[PDB]
From a paper:
CDT is a member of the Iota family of protein toxins which also consists of two homologous toxins produced by Clostridium perfringens (the Iota toxin) and Clostridium spiroforme (C. spiroforme Transferase, CST). All three Iota toxin family members are assembled from two polypeptide chains termed the “A” subunit (CDTa, Ia, and CSTa) and “B”, subunit (CDTb, Ib, and CSTb). All three B subunits are presumed to contain five domains that are involved in regulation (D1), oligomerization (D2 and D3), and host recognition (D3’ and D4). Once proteolyzed, the mature form of CDTb forms a large heptameric, soluble structure referred to as the prepore which binds one molecule of CDTa to generate the toxic moiety, CDT.
We also uncovered a subpopulation of the CDTb trimer bound to CDTa but note that these particles are present in a significantly lower abundance, indicating the CDTa bound dimer is preferred. Still, we were able to generate a low-resolution map (8.15 Å) and assemble a model of the CDTb trimer bound to CDTa. The resulting structure illustrates rotations of Chains B and C of ~4° and ~9° about the central pseudosymmetry axis when compared to the apo structure, respectively, that allows for interactions with CDTa in both chains. This results in an orientation of Chain C that closely resembles CDTb protomers as they are arranged in the symmetric heptamer. (G) The relative orientations of Chains B and C within the trimeric intermediate shift to contact CDTa, resulting in a structure that resembles that of the assembled, symmetric prepore. Similarly, the reorientation of CDTb protomers in the assembly intermediates bound to CDTa suggests that CDTa may also induce toxin assembly through the stabilization of the heptameric form of CDTb.
Numbering used by the authors:
A (entry chain Z): 28 to 424
B (entry chain C), C (entry chain B), D (entry chain A): 218 to 315, 319 to 451, 457 to 748
The structure:
């Protein structure tokens, strides 16, 4: 723990008054500020501006964005299995042996998949041993890449590492080791970073306009004309055509040419990056109704049914998908309890539709019809007393 | 399932069964006894079940300082080390620099002799007490001197000290450890004591030895040069103690204060021996454990074992007998009613037992309630001292027969022995052990066991030596234990012979000759 | 799928197969042994298979210090450094500041003299024991010096010492490291002794020996001037030991307490030797390893070999034979029953073996159980001492021969030998070995192997030297080893004559001349 | 694309292409070879390609200290420190504090003196080995002393020493660096040895020299006042070595131990030299790297280049020839089949190579499978030494002729030479060289190349000097190297004539006069 303390008092002498005040604020309120940094971006922008913990969040986040490192590191931590989409226990605190079948099922749940890390978190740099806090058998051993936030900071006679994780991790492999007589899972993982904007949306708008100022020039008149029909009112008709299985039941060649033009226009300029985007979804996209008992997430068994029904499955959207780069709550979808957090790899068809002037849309990305989303994580938060879900999904070929 | 201490082992697995395999506790069910494994008991009311700085689990897993001997794997014993200091050659010089009248003599060191120096034997041993009572107790720390290479010559002759001023002394010293623990940062303070008067205290500091003293190893390893006291510098003497070396007295040595460190493995790498002290555990082990010394003629062993006080039902601690405590503290193989080492037989009719006055009184109090008439089925309590003196010669008319001189009239066609057979007699029995293997200026005690299936069959014995002695013994139906003592003289003496004459019906068993101490030399 | 220790090796691989390539550990399948890839073994109970402060895979991968000898990359071979001191020439001067009388004598230093001095020789060797014993065992830490530039003259003539006042002794010393480990913070304490009398001790501290002493080189780098004892400054001497040195005895030097640190990698960048020490591992590694010494006439090595403890099935540690252990600890090319170094061939019928008494007892116990009756196919045990002496001359009527003269009446055209060819005899065999090729005043053993399928075809041999002799050896059906010893004088003497005659049927092989010790010359 | 070490360079770009440009690595296509980037090849298993305290990225990108010579930009050459002491003047003074008698003598220093002193020069060269075998190999650590103003005069006949008390010796020293490493905490030690006898040890401490010693310069900045042995006080001598200094022997001053540090770039600003030193990277370098020395007659250089051991297929280290190793060690411009320094050509025919027994034997053994029979086409191995000496005078019958005199009968109009043109021999070819521009009391060697397109043509070469000689030469169709030595004498002698007479058909080329060592003077 020598290097963590050394860099802790190296950073601490260049931390100013409000930064250090936010540092003791995280020292006394680590869990609450951590969960707030996890779930703050889904509230209203004015809820953010009036939030008491938002000042601490932005001070700590700026400190994380200014204390960087030039080389990748390996760090060890213990985190709940519920945080990494494993909704069961492998071995308990009194249990010390892990059988082959539970190792196999944990392997097949963690295989070939990505898991998000968001918010503030305190992490030790070295492998915990005899007397260190080992609450779970899941020892995550992560390779943080270059230019990633890294804060050694001393609390009383101990030292920890505050970071603002905003990245997904790909667990390359796991092993079963014996520490203090107990079977622990040591997980070698790789950080996969994503272009996520959360609440800062003006600069995301600038990026989309810079990447898509010439997009309307690249489209054919059929494709550009059908897109212009689409955002100005034809989205309702085209989505009603596609959702009701139009080309199969009662095929409309005009609407078939319309959706072909929309797909071609989305295919003209692929997105040059992997993105994290927020779509405000309703119950009908999940085969449910507003009056259905499962929509009321204020009770926990509805969330359990949501986990049992939708986690590990593929969500099919036969219509074009409208997504918003801003996670901020809006008056249009305040009542909706589903905010789908979608990850999109490189080269996918689509467009940032707000680059075209004259549209009153708010930072919208269009996605091709018939898409398949892989459900990965479902967190929860409290918009007031209304319990809402955070469905972190992705785009899969 | 239920846990009390800072240990992983359950309460049921801390009692009447203890098996620790692949760092996992399991109950002993007695099907893996012959596969080299052993069962323990450790306390379920304290993490440190013994006085050592090691809990039961780390001391039973093998997870401790590996320089500690394997005899401390059981949780019963504590890692208690002892520094003893001995001397070999004394040189007397009359200068403060080095020229002068210098005389050099070789002298043998006796570790465990003063504990059994004031012991008296009896012709018949009453009741079931087959031991001897001592008047004082001494550990392996003290070390006595016996001068051997000394022809007829006064010590003042070699120095020519006339009226007022005698010479200076200088010695060759060596350091030994008799204990199952290593110390590194040695701070040995010793005192060169003269029959109640102290000449000098020697501090060997840190540079003369170093930060390494392995358990059971002399500071010069096997055969090298002794460490001279020429590397707090010189020790004087007057013309009052110079003449007291001559007649009866032997100069002794006693270490007083010793401190050190014990190696503790860290979380990742190497053992830390800097931030430590062997001073917070001296009263931790000394006040709770017992003391057992075993004196082999080649080496000495000292052990401390945790026991039970009988007048306290609150303290839930393991209960130990005598023989089980010896087997646990030393490591022994269990033959049919027999406890064996790799070559050393230990039994109530095979070794000499020395007890202090209070412990002998306790045992005589406890020997009444036993219905088996044995000395090893005695419960162990806090605050005893045990001396087990292995005889230098012992026969039992069995597989063990190590006598360099053959007997006479040997009849082994019998079966009414204490173990194996009993020696049938027809007439005399002659033994003639030569001076080539008797150490001069010593005292030897021959003890034996007899049976006699006749009303008034009696025997005579003659110990023909420099001080010969005749004796008349009346054996009984059961096993009677008898002990006789004799001395010897220098190399120019004749062989020592033992003649025993019975009448053809008495039976002899377990005949052992042992050495006790040194006699003063006329000089 | 399963691993145990603080290491990356799987538990299933770690027994009976071990290969490291491109920093991955793969099993051994006996297919790439000729591409420089070799198998090892590792203990799956601890992260440190050896007693080193390094793990087994990391020390078997090369990701550590390169100054260590590369045959120590085997995880079963641990790093063990030894500091030795060697005197080169002696100067005696009568002034403490430096006029007066100053004499100088030229000496040569040898490493294995006291161990060999306790070894006796015999004409024939009974049963499978084809070695001898040493009286006391010592390593190459102590050394013995022999003066070549000393004709007949006493030291008193050039010093003029009458009654008590003597001169001052100065010596030229060098420091060498014969082991597979370095040390940096060298603080050696060395006693200068003569038959027990410790003359003085010297600390070289830091300013004279340097902040490094790499393995494979002494303190002067190849040929430079040796260190003089003028920079703790001088040591005194008296007129009671000079004639002792003059008659038979010699000055020996040995170090006692040596300080030093070991190198290791840091987290990211450089390497640090500040928080390390070669002082807390000695008691760990000597109590867990055996000891092997090899003494070629040019250079010597000594390594510590961990073995398998026999009387514990729980301790799952691999077992070793003798020759496999020697090959892995030193590095020797393995031809068909052949272990060859870069130049020195080592076998059982090519070198000399020195044991102590305990090794002889244990090897006579374990050697009877072998059905092949060979010395090397015996399972190795903990803490056991072996020494190998390379003969200065060895011939076998085969590819190897390093003799000063050419053997007479040689008939190599044979196949009935232990190693291919053997010398068929039809007549006398002669050699005339000169004093131009031999050091003065030494003790030598010529050994050989005689074989004849005939009854009593007796052989006589005459060794004409300064101690000339004749001997007779009868042949046997077995392959019988004979060893003879002799002495010489200063190099102005004639050729040594070796004459031997049988009866033209007997066969001889493996004729080796080796040195043992220095005879005490008369002066 | 795949990266292993902790550097920006991927492993695919760590072999066969390595472009450091604007602090990024990109791939060669052989287009910007004249735009200023030399060949870098680095280990893709080792981040530290060499034993230097740097990764391969930092040393190949300029992100290190400015005082390091830029020749260590290539990752195969390690920045290895060499510190040498130069001798300028000697004074003999009979006092100890500083009236008295004092003489002063001027002394030249020779760096590569003892390395080439054991070079035995034969008249005919075997196979393609155009190099000789030195007996001993020595680097530029030691320095040799030569007296120039050695008029006929005993050193004692003016100093007036009668029996026992000899005078004292003072001198001035300079501290240079021949290598690519700056020393900051310069604390060395050196021995002043006359013909084996050590006189004294000298340490310059820290404040007397300063906090920096750059590569390639001395503490006296070029021509300034030398630092004497006054500001560890004065060096005595006895009445046994003055005749040795006078008659045949010379004072050697050898640097024994070098202690120093370096300054590395921190994250913020300039170098930091507190927590790092030159203490452990020496053995890392010399155990993996060879040693290549250049001695141009103005100044010398030494470099350590990492090499390959053949018995290691996992060792993916770069492999080079001799000439490629020389070019990367020193830096040379490559034209068509030839390499050049700023003014010094480099070839196996222009500058001469010296190897010890191991390197010469390895080059002889490795030349058997080659078909070109050239020196520089030998693969670089570890543990081998190259000493390249540059001739003090060389002509090639071409654009280069540094001979101060003009030859006789030079016929440049020819084309069948190794390089350019050659002299068509017609009759006598003569040159004279004055004694003024040749160093007195030294040994010179003249070497050259001959061809004869006939059967048995012959040349005679007469060297008229103070040992004038005539040598016979029988050339053949193949190219013959001829090399003859002679000794120089004082300035007041005649000139030296080099004459050669042939039949008028042979061809001569590449004539080189070199100084090798200094001859002792009778005094
Ligand atoms: Ca318990
Ligand atoms: Ca317990
Ligand atoms: Ca019996
Ligand atoms: Ca393992
Ligand atoms: Ca291991
Ligand atoms: Ca042979
Ligand atoms: Ca790479
Ligand atoms: Ca690299
Ligand atoms: Ca030519």
């Amino acid at each position: 723990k020598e290097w963590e303390r050394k860099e802790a008092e190296r950073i601490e002498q260049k931390l100013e008054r409000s930064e250090k005040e936010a540092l003791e604020s995280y020292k006394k309120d680590s869990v609450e500020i951590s969960k707030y940094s996890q779930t703050r971006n889904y509230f209203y922008d004015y809820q953010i501006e009036a939030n008491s913990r938002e000042k601490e969040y932005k001070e700590l986040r700026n400190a994380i964005s200014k204390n960087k490192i030039d080389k990748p590191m390996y760090v060890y931590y213990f985190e709940s299995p519920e945080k990494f989409a494993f909704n069961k226990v492998i071995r308990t605190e009194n249990q010390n042996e892990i059988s082959l079948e539970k190792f196999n099922e944990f392997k097949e749940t963690i295989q070939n998949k990505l898991f998000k890390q968001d918010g503030f978190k305190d992490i030790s740099l070295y492998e915990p041993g005899k007397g260190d806090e080992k609450p779970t058998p899941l020892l995550m051993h992560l390779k943080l890449p270059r230019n990633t936030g890294m804060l050694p900071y001393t609390n009383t006679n101990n030292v920890s590492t505050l970071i603002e994780q905003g990245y997904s991790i790909k667990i390359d492999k796991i092993v079963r080791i014996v520490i203090d007589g107990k079977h622990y899972i040591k997980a070698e993982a790789s950080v996969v970073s994503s272009l996520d904007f959360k609440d800062d949306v003006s600069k995301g708008d600038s990026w989309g306009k810079a990447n898509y100022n010439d997009w309307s020039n690249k489209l054919t008149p059929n494709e550009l004309a059908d897109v212009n029909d689409y955002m100005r009112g034809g989205y309702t008709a085209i989505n009603n055509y596609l959702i009701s299985n139009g080309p199969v039941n009662n095929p409309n060649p005009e609407l078939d040419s319309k959706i072909t033009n929309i797909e071609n226009a989305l295919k003209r300029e692929p997105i040059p990056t992997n993105l994290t985007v927020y779509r405000r979804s309703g119950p009908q996209e999940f085969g449910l109704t507003l009056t259905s008992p499962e929509y009321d997430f204020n009770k926990l068994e509805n969330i359990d049914a949501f986990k049992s029904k939708w986690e590990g499955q593929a969500l099919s959207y036969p219509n074009f998908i409208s997504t918003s780069i801003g996670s901020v709550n809006m008056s249009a979808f305040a009542k909706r309890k589903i905010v789908l957090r979608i990850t999109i790899p490189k080269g996918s068809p689509g467009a940032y539709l707000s680059a075209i002037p004259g549209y009153a849309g708010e930072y919208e990305v269009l996605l091709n019809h018939g898409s398949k989303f892989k459900i990965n994580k479902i967190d929860s938060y409290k918009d007031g007393t209304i319990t809402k879900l955070i469905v972190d999904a992705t785009l899969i070929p | 399932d239920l846990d009390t201490d800072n240990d992983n082992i359950p309460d049921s697995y801390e009692r009447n069964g203890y098996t620790i395999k692949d760092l996992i506790a399991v109950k002993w069910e007695d099907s893996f006894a012959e596969q080299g494994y052993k069962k323990y008991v450790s306390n379920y009311l304290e993490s440190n079940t013994a006085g050592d700085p090691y809990t039961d689990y780390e001391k039973a897993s093998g997870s401790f300082d590996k320089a500690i001997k394997t005899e401390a794997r059981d949780p019963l014993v504590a890692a208690y080390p002892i520094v003893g200091v001995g001397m070999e050659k004394l040189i007397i010089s009359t200068n403060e620099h080095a020229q002068g009248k210098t005389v050099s003599r070789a002298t043998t060191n006796s570790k465990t002799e003063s504990n059994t120096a004031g012991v008296s034997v009896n012709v018949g041993y009453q009741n079931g007490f087959t031991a001897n009572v001592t008047t004082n107790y001494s550990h392996t720390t003290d070390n006595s001197t016996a001068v051997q290479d000394s022809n007829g010559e006064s010590w003042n002759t070699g120095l020519s000290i006339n009226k007022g001023e005698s010479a200076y002394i200088n010695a060759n010293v060596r350091y030994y450890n008799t204990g199952t623990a290593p110390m590194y940062k040695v701070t040995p303070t010793t005192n060169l004591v003269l029959d109640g008067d102290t000449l000098s205290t020697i501090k060997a500091q840190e540079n003369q030895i170093g930060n390494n003293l392995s358990p059971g190893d002399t500071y010069p390893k096997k055969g090298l040069s002794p460490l001279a006291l020429n590397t707090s510098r010189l020790i004087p003497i007057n013309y009052d103690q110079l003449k007291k070396l001559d007649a009866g007295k032997q100069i002794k040595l006693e270490t007083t204060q010793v401190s050190g460190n014990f190696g503790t493995k860290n979380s990742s790498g190497q053992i830390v021996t800097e931030g430590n002290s062997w001073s917070d555990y001296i009263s931790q082990i000394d006040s709770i454990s017992a003391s057992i010394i075993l004196d082999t003629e080649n080496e000495s062993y000292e052990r401390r074992v945790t026991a039970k006080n009988l007048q306290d039902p609150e303290d839930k601690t393991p209960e130990l007998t005598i023989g089980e405590a010896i087997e646990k503290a030393f490591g022994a193989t269990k033959k049919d009613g027999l406890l064996y080492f790799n070559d050393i037989p230990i039994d109530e009719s095979c070794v000499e037992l020395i007890f202090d006055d209070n412990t002998a009184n306790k045992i005589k109090d406890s020997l009444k309630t036993l219905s088996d008439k044995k000395i090893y089925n005695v419960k162990l309590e806090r605050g005893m001292n045990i001396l087990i003196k292995t005889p230098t010669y012992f026969t039992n008319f069995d597989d063990y027969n190590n006598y360099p001189s053959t007997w006479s009239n040997v009849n082994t066609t019998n079966q009414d022995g204490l173990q194996g057979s009993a020696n049938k007699l027809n007439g005399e029995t002659k033994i003639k052990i030569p001076m080539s293997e008797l150490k001069p200026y010593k005292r030897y005690v021959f003890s034996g066991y007899s049976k006699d299936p006749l009303t008034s069959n009696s025997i005579i014995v003659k110990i023909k030596a420099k001080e010969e002695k005749t004796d008349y013994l009346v054996p009984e139906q059961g096993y009677t234990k008898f002990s006789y003592e004799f001395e010897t003289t220098e190399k120019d003496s004749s062989n020592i012979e033992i003649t025993l004459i019975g009448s053809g019906t008495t039976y002899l068993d377990n005949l052992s000759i042992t050495e006790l101490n040194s006699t003063p030399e006329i000089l």
